[PDB]
Design a protein around this ligand. Structure first.
Ligand SMILES: [Mg+2]
Ligand SMILES: [Zn+2]
Ligand SMILES: [Zn+2]
Ligand SMILES: [Zn+2]
Lengths: 69, 46, 24, 101, 49, 98, 344, 43, 73, 244, 42, 305
């Protein structure tokens, strides 16, 4: 659903780099390879959490019963 | 076929003698094979 | 039949624990 | 003091008490392999080794068999002293390297 | 061991066994009644004479 | 149907189809193993079921009908027979068996 | 927490299945290390499970109804809402003041879900949660009548949300039919760490392979570790490689440029003793997926309970606490042992 | 207010012997909304 | 959570014979009712029977008679 | 215990209870997965509980797991260790295994534990080392000897047996003799251990210990060898890679 | 000492040792004599 | 063996030191003790993280137990010496005091912004408070804590942690009761990102490799491991601390009998990173001083029967 706070294998606090990843991937127009190492994801256990994340909360939010559409 | 072996046995007035281990489960006795193959008596003095 | 093409332009993504990218 | 941390077992103890086997509670390979290393450096211990009887529950058994020069329990407590003087070397060697850095 | 079975604590609470009271187990059936039905080792019923 | 490929380097599209054709033939073959060798045991077991060794070492039925005069010819348990004619083993380990 | 795979076929994008993720890219070590992972059983790192690894949640809807048994023309015999006589007042802790539960409460087996005040019996009645699993309450709907007035709220629909954390006995699988049961949750200090500090997440036995021959699962662990490092995804359609260009010579080459071992091996230390293990062992990133058939829908225990009326035997249960079976095949085994006292 | 309409999402409340539909659309399915309570959880 | 009923079949109570200690019914002060077990049928002409209590059958849908007709008017 | 479908009578055995904390599944040892034909992916087993003292004496003296080492089909054993324990005994009883003084006594006590269960002595007896100089090491064939020295009763002598296994001599090198297994008075001198010895095979070591010493010491050696090949794996673990 | 014990159930053990190995051969056929269980059914 | 025979040979040698990680060697110590320090820093060193979350109101789309869980994994910047240990014996009358607990709170509502540019997309300027970060957790002092924590306040150590996402109409309102705990009970108390070691690799060359083959010998390692000294033109080891050992030379047939690859087996290169609460050098003193206290507490209990 949303980006997890801690990486599963090591335990590094990784939940805050998600918007700063989607900034570096959009504005500076990089690949997925130098973008991840710029944030300091030097292993590959914490590196897959940002890389292969599907942010499925953005589909769950559009079904909102507290505002008239 | 249960009715067939039943109607033969009633017409013969056959006494069942409760020896098979399937007959003793119907009536509810102790089996004959294994540990139910003897009697244990006690030895009281006087 | 053409080969599955090489992904080109790679570099060392794994250093010793205490050493970094600029040392090498 | 606590009466439930370490208890000596009776099913595995000699009469004169030169071969006994304990059972510590709330310990693992953390203490058990660090205790087993410093007991075996004492030159009167013939046999020493731990064994965790189940990884679900939390116990730890130590076995000590000596030659006869001392008891099992005195062989145990000399290692616990020597472990306490072994952590004190590393801590005293670490402040020196932090400060002189 | 090879001849054992690991009963989890959800079966070790509901399964009982009628163990009568004699002089040799009255030390242990008192401790097993006080423990109640929700502490292993315990007991969940009595039965009068 | 000859497949010259291996599972380390992978097989061709034609050989993949032949291998799935023989892989399905095992799964239907297991699908008969359940129920067909189960009625065989029921017919035997319901009829015998009471054929017990008596105290004469004969093999009587439940109703006293004799069937064998000894179990198999020599009154020997199969669970205790394994080292009965291993003669060198009883000789090399004579004192432990005494 | 769903994840998109690293080793994906090219129909993952053209069919749009990234909208519905199935699993999580676990870090799998192929090693026999604990002795708890023989015969199709696996080991999950505990301190990866307690950071939410395959956390699941099962919803379940019950429709509370009282428009039944009404005989087609009768007045509204029972109503929702609280009455005016005595009622034990700990019903107010979990029910709101119209006979509907508070949204988000924590229900157990015994708590009320609605309090309908009858009229022909003059009593503040109750309806109770039947299943033994502690559930919350996510949504309550007030369904009105499609026909005319009848307007005392005769049909309500409650949806309970049930937590499902990965326990011991929960089946997992790979994408290759390696279906296995989690057998213990291993503490993270006792796991084999690597030379960079990554304890595994899932330890799978190496004895599972040579009878099943899943050599896809050996190449998938290379294409995950090579794909995570350089930050690329890998193509894995069937029949793109052949005899000359094998994938272990291809995905092994990407590993060698990243400073790893060409055969996918890692030098890994032990956790209990602390010494280096003998062989360099074989880790990777294999896309798992969590099966259903949780253990909580399986077990069953009976001591004494509800019987059948004709034969005085227990009932066919798991929902009525009913006994198991001693069939006609377990009866013929108990005679063959010679135990006629376990038969009675 | 207690309830919420399904179709137009406008808050409302009902009474005893009152029609179960919204007052701006007449939709006949109402979601009981969430109030302020004190559920305790373990993190 | 209780259910009213008889006192007890022994002199050793008064109680309201509470519900099911699994299988059989119980009084407040402990005594399991001796002896009856909860029935169940796990698996036409529809009749007017309302079996609710412990799997045993109850009567038809006439209540105490005039109260449904005095309160309706 | 019981597992449907119950084909043969050795699939309804009788086990002794060991009550574990913090779980929800029944826990079983691998030596009984020959009898129930069990695989640990979702298999479910019943469990019964006899209530008098007659049917309690008969699940311990007539139907237990000690008494059923051999099926009455032909007589072959159906009770023995499996996959990781057969691949550990190849690496531990190899010629190349040399343990120092610390690792020798750790592997002995970790499996034997005299304060409960089986150690027929009072102390724990060891063997003098193989290499005496310049660095006193032991061999892996002295660990299987020291285990068999403590579980065997002291008033009976050792066991003598010559047998084979499934690995031919050509795989080790020329002049080798590791296909012949030789026990001389309870002491492994030659050969490595395989599935043919402590698996479900006829005329191995644990079949002979069943026949000389009776069933109660057969199913003790099977348990002790379970824990020796478990803690040995946890120190020198065993993988299966791609380059293989 | 290796004799049979009186009271044993050899009638059951004979049936569970013909039936139980016969699960491992169920009609999975490739002189010409009948093989497998359809021979054993006759 | 004796302690003076340990005190003379033992040698710590720090390589680098930051506020987030640390790299330091340990030469001449046994593996039963260097591993004993690794298992203590992960499992038994106390730290602070929210154990209980009390939900006043939540109408967001993320359900309650997930949001309760995502708060529990945020590293607070509370020094864990400053609190005391909760007693899990008492009821709530004497469970939480001003010395056990720290109270955190979170209150966010989200509504539409009518100054939205037409056709915009980003919910930073299309909604008001649509992203609930972790810095929105407010420290609430209870008791003597206004005097105690007046110097340093409770801040999460990495504040941009995304906790939820909101749309108009929705609101989050909770309270959190942060306590002390060790990392062996739950994985949110472990005050360490990762903490490992590795033995120093040992490259020894047997036959003196020279020429163009020595240039082909150097490239099977990281740059800086193996050097080629001019003059004699023989390959020599610059440093093996940079070795990332991967066994690249053993794939080549013409180098597989010139090099053996081994370890030093008493040269533990530790590498400690911190999760956010404490300094990396403060954890290693806490692991040494816990193994000293795990022995001294065992040294004074009497040994019953
Ligand atoms: Mg299975
Ligand atoms: Zn990570
Ligand atoms: Zn409406
Ligand atoms: Zn009563």
């Amino acid at each position: 659903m949303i980006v997890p706070v801690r990486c599963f294998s090591c335990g590094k606090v990784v939940g805050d780099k998600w918007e700063s990843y989607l900034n570096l991937l959009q504005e500076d127009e990089l690949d997925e390879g130098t973008a991840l190492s710029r944030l300091g994801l030097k292993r590959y256990c914490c590196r897959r959490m940002i890389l292969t994340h599907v942010d499925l909360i953005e589909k769950f939010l559009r079904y909102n019963p507290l505002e008239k559409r | 076929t249960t009715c067939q072996f039943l109607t033969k046995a009633v017409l013969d007035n056959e006494r069942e003698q409760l020896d098979s281990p399937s007959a003793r489960i119907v009536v509810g006795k102790l089996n004959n094979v294994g540990t139910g193959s003897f009697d244990v008596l006690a030895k009281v003095p006087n | 039949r053409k080969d599955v093409p090489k992904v080109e332009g790679l570099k060392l993504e794994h250093f010793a624990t205490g050493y970094d990218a600029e040392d090498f | 003091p606590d009466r439930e941390k370490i208890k000596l077992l009776t099913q595995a103890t000699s009469e004169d008490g030169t071969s006994a086997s304990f059972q510590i509670v709330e310990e693992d390979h953390t203490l058990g392999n660090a205790l087993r290393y410093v007991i075996m450096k004492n030159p009167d211990v013939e046999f020493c080794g731990y064994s965790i009887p189940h990884p679900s529950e939390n116990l730890l058994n130590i076995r000590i068999q000596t030659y006869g020069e001392t008891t099992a329990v005195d062989a145990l407590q000399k290692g616990l002293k020597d472990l306490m003087d072994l952590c004190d070397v590393v801590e005293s060697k670490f402040t020196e390297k932090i400060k002189s850095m | 061991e090879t001849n054992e079975i690991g009963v989890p604590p959800v079966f070790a609470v509901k399964l009982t066994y009628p163990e009568p009271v004699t002089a040799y187990n009255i030390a242990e059936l008192r401790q097993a009644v006080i423990n109640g039905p929700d502490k292993w080792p315990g007991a969940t019923q009595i039965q009068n004479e | 149907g000859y497949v010259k490929g291996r599972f380390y380097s992978g097989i061709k599209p034609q050989e993949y189809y032949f291998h799935c054709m023989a892989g399905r033939e095992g799964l239907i073959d297991t699908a008969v193993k359940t129920s067909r060798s189960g009625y065989l045991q029921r017919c035997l077991t319901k009829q015998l079921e009471g054929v017990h060794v008596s105290y004469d070492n004969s093999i009587r039925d439940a109703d006293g009908t004799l069937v064998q005069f000894m179990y198999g010819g020599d009154a020997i348990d199969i669970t205790k027979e394994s080292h009965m004619t291993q003669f060198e083993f009883c000789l090399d380990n004579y004192y432990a068996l005494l | 927490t769903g994840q998109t795979p690293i080793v994906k076929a090219n129909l993952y994008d053209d069919y749009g299945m990234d909208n519905f993720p199935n699993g999580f890219n676990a870090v799998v070590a192929v090693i026999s290390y604990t002795g708890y992972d023989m015969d199709d059983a696996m080991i999950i790192n505990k301190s990866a499970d307690e950071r939410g690894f395959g956390y699941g949640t099962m919803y379940k809807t019950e429709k509370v109804d009282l428009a039944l048994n009404r005989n087609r023309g009768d007045p509204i015999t029972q109503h929702f809402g609280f009455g005016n006589d005595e009622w034990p007042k700990e019903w107010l802790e979990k029910l709101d003041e119209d006979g509907l539960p508070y949204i988000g409460t924590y229900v157990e087996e015994g708590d009320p879900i609605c309090a309908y005040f009858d009229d022909t019996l003059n009593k503040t009645k109750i309806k109770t949660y039947h299943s033994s699993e502690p559930a919350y309450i996510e949504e309550v709907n007030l369904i009105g009548d499609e026909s005319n007035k009848f307007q005392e709220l005769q049909t309500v629909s409650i949806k309970y949300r049930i937590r499902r954390t990965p326990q011991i006995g929960d089946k997992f699988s790979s994408r290759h039919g390696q279906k296995g049961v989690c057998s213990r949750k291993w503490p993270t200090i006792d796991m084999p760490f690597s030379e960079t500090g990554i304890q595994p997440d899932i330890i799978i036995n190496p004895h599972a392979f040579p009878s099943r021959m899943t050599i896809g699962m050996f190449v998938e662990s290379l294409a995950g570790k090579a794909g995570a490092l350089h930050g690329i995804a890998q193509d894995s359609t069937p029949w793109i490689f052949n005899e000359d260009d094998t994938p272990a010579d291809y995905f092994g080459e990407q590993l060698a440029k990243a400073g790893y071992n060409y055969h996918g091996n890692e030098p890994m230390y032990s956790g209990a003793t602390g010494e280096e293990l003998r062989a360099d062992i074989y880790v990777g990133v294999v896309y798992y997926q969590r099966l259903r058939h949780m253990v909580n829908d399986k077990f069953q225990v009976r001591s004494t309970g509800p019987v059948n009326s004709l034969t005085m035997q227990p009932v066919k249960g798991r929902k009525r606490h009913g006994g198991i079976r001693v069939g006609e095949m377990e009866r013929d085994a108990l005679i063959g042992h010679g135990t006629s006292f376990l038969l009675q | 207010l207690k309830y919420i309409c399904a179709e137009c999402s406008s808050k409302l409340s009902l009474s005893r012997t009152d029609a179960v539909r919204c007052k701006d659309c007449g939709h006949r399915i109402l979601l009981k909304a969430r109030t302020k309570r004190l559920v305790q959880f373990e993190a | 959570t209780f259910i009213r009923g008889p006192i007890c079949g022994t002199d050793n109570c008064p109680s309201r014979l509470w519900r099911i200690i699994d299988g059989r019914r119980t009084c407040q002060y402990g005594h399991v009712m001796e002896g009856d077990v909860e029935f169940n049928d796990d698996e036409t002409r529809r009749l007017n029977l309302t079996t609710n209590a412990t799997g045993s059958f109850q009567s038809s849908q006439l209540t105490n008679s005039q109260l449904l007709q005095q309160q309706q008017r | 215990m019981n597992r449907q479908p119950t084909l043969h009578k050795a699939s309804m055995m009788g086990h002794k209870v060991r009550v574990l904390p913090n779980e929800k599944t029944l826990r079983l040892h691998y030596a009984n997965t020959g009898a129930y034909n069990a695989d640990f992916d979702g298999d479910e087993m019943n469990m019964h509980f006899p209530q008098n003292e007659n049917a309690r004496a008969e699940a311990l003296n007539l139907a237990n797991t000690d008494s059923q080492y051999l099926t009455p089909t032909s007589g072959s054993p159906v009770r023995g260790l499996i996959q990781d324990h057969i691949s550990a005994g190849v690496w531990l009883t190899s010629k190349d295994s040399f343990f120092t003084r610390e690792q020798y006594q750790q592997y002995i006590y970790g499996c034997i534990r005299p304060e409960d269960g089986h150690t027929t002595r009072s102390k724990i007896v060891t063997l003098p080392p193989t290499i005496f100089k310049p660095y006193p090491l032991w061999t892996g064939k002295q660990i299987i000897t020291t285990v068999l020295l403590n579980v065997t009763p002291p008033d009976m002598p050792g066991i003598n047996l010559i047998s084979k296994n499934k690995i031919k001599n050509e795989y080790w090198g020329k002049g080798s003799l590791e296909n012949e297994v030789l026990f001389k008075d309870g002491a492994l001198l030659c050969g490595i251990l395989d599935k043919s010895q402590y698996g479900a095979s006829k005329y191995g070591i644990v079949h002979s210990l069943h026949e000389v010493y009776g069933p109660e010491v057969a199913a003790k050696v099977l348990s002790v060898l379970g824990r020796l090949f478990t803690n040995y794996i946890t120190a020198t673990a065993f993988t299966c890679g791609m380059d293989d | 000492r290796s004799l049979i014990n009186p009271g044993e159930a050899v009638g059951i053990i004979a049936s569970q040792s013909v039936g139980e190995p016969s699960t491992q051969m169920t009609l999975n056929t490739f002189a010409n004599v009948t093989l497998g269980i359809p021979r054993l059914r006759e | 063996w004796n302690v003076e025979k340990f005190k003379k040979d033992f040698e710590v040698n720090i390589s680098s030191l930051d506020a987030r990680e640390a790299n330091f060697d340990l030469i001449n110590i046994d593996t039963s003790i260097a591993n004993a320090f690794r298992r203590i820093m992960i499992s038994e060193v106390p730290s602070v993280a929210a154990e209980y979350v009390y939900f006043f109101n939540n109408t967001s789309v993320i359900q309650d137990e997930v949001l309760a869980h995502r708060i529990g994994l945020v590293p607070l910047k509370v020094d864990p010496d400053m609190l005391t240990w909760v007693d899990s014996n008492l009821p709530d009358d004497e469970k939480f005091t001003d010395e056990n607990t720290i109270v955190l709170s979170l209150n966010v509502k989200c509504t539409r912004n009518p100054d939205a540019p037409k056709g915009s997309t980003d919910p930073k300027e299309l909604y008001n408070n649509a992203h609930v970060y972790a810095r929105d957790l407010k420290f609430e002092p209870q008791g003597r804590q206004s005097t105690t924590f007046a110097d340093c306040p409770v801040v999460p150590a990495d504040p941009d942690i995304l906790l939820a996402k909101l749309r108009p109409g929705q609101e989050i309102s909770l309270k959190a009761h942060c306590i002390l705990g060790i990392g062996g009970d739950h994985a949110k108390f472990s005050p360490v990102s990762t903490a490992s070691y590795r033995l120093l690799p040992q490259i020894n060359i047997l036959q003196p490799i020279k020429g163009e083959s020595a240039r082909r010998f150097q490239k099977c390692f990281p740059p800086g491991v193996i050097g080629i000294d001019e003059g004699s033109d023989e390959a020599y080891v610059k440093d093996a601390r940079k070795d990332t050992v991967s066994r690249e030379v053993l794939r080549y047939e013409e180098f597989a009998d010139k090099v053996k690859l081994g370890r030093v087996r008493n040269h533990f290169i530790f590498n400690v990173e911190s999760a956010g609460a404490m300094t990396p050098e403060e954890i290693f003193f806490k692991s040494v001083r816990i193994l000293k206290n795990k022995a001294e507490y065992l040294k004074n209990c009497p040994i019953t029967q």
